[PDB]
Amino acid sequence: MEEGGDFDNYYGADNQSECEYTDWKSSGALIPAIYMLVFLLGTTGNGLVLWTVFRKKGHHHHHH
Numbered sequence: 001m002e003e004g005g006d007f008d009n010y011y012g013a014d015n016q017s018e019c020e021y022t023d024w025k026s027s028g029a030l031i032p033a034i035y036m037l038v039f040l041l042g043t044t045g046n047g048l049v050l051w052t053v054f055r056k057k058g059h060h061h062h063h064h
Contacts, residue, residue: 015021022028
């Protein structure tokens, strides 16, 4: 449970219901909800790193 009761509980603020500190412009609720299950899925860095092999054969023009 990691109690660690000292200065990490309602001791200041921590935005309890602000919802107006990083939403007043909605820039961190629609971007971190798609670029996740996508950016690291439809590629994961294995599409622009491996598939290349099937192309590095001749950056110019193969099909001799």
